[PDB]
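C-ALPHA CELLS:
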Amino acid sequence: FSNRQARILYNKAIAKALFGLDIEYHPKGLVTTPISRYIFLKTFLRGGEVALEIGTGHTAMMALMAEKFFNCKVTATEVDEEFFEYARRNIERNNSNVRLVKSNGGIIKGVVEGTFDVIFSAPPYYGGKYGEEFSVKLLEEAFDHLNPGGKVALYLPDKEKLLNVIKERGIKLGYSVKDIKFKVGTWRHSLIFFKGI
C-alpha cells in the first residue's frame, strides 16, 4: 500500500528531523509515530533510569529514544523474529547500546531477569473482554522486577472501559496510578503505575 508508504516516509522524516534517528520500517509493521511516543516518554522518564521496554517492535523507536534523550540503560524485548531482525538493524544503524532480547512468547518472566526503575510498553490492546489481558499480566509480572519507587508506564488508546479495567487491576496489585491524556494526534493516554516505598 502506497498510503502507508507516504505515512512511513513522513514518519521516518520526523524521526530524523526531530530525534536524529535513521529508522527502517518493516513493510507489515505498525507505522510507529515517533512524536507521540516521545511525548509518552516525557510523561514519566526523568533521566538515568535502568529501563525495560516490552515489545519494542520493528522500529525499536522508544528504546532508542529512552537511551539517546533520557540517558537510560535500556533492555528491550521483541517476540516476532522478523520484527526482532529490524529492531537489531535499527539499534545498529543508530550506534545504540540498547540490549535487544528475543521473547519466545512471554512478557517478562521467562524472557528477562533483573530489576528496573522503569518498565514500559505500548501494548497491542485489541485479549480479555476489553483487550486488557496483556496489560494486566505485564503489571502482575513487573512487580518483582521493579526497584523501590520503580514504575510501569503503558501507552494506550482512548478507550474508556479498557483504561478503567487496567487502572482498577493495577491498583488491586498495589500500585498507585497517574493517567495523563494527550492528542498528538489523529487521543492517547499514558497510564503510569507507581510501586513506591
